[PDB]
Amino acid sequence: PQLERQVETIRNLVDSYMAIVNKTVRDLMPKTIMHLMINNTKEFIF
């Protein structure tokens, strides 16, 4: 029936949205670590 087309649409939209979420996680995870652990240790050392 037509319901399969609806499933297809949702299947594609989730992929597209998760394509955006990964970028954000890839960009923010290293910076979250630079601010709170690496740069804090450096400033503590100096």
């Binding site: 970028k23 890839r26 960009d27 923010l28 910076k31 979250t32 630079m34 601010h35």
Partner: protein, 97 residues
């Protein structure tokens, strides 16, 4: 020294300088949203209630809570800009990337 190649900090410090300009509008947005939440709580309390004591107390409580939360909503906006300044990620959607 002498300029054989372009330094990185010529890029990093101009970017870090322009990124710091973003703190202001981000805190404007939080103030505007708190304005709307207070407005709506006033509409709900105006419409429903004609026990003056109960409408007064209920609106005081819901607005005190929204105020105690503005103090937590604005920390994560400052901390997100700080996180934006901690590291320069040139691996995606950029000329180099």
């Amino acid at each position: 020294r002498t300029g054989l190649f372009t330094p990185d900090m010529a890029f990093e410090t101009i970017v870090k300088k322009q990124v710091k300009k973003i703190r202001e509008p981000c805190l404007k947005c939080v103030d505007m949203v708190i304005s709307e939440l207070i407005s709506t709580v006033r509409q709900c309390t105006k419409k429903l209630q004609q026990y003056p004591r109960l409408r007064e107390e209920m609106e005081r409580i819901v607005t005190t809570h929204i105020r105690e939360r503005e103090g937590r909503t604005k920390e994560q906006v400052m901390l997100l800009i700080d996180i934006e300044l901690a590291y320069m990620n040139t691996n995606h959607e950029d000329f180099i990337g």
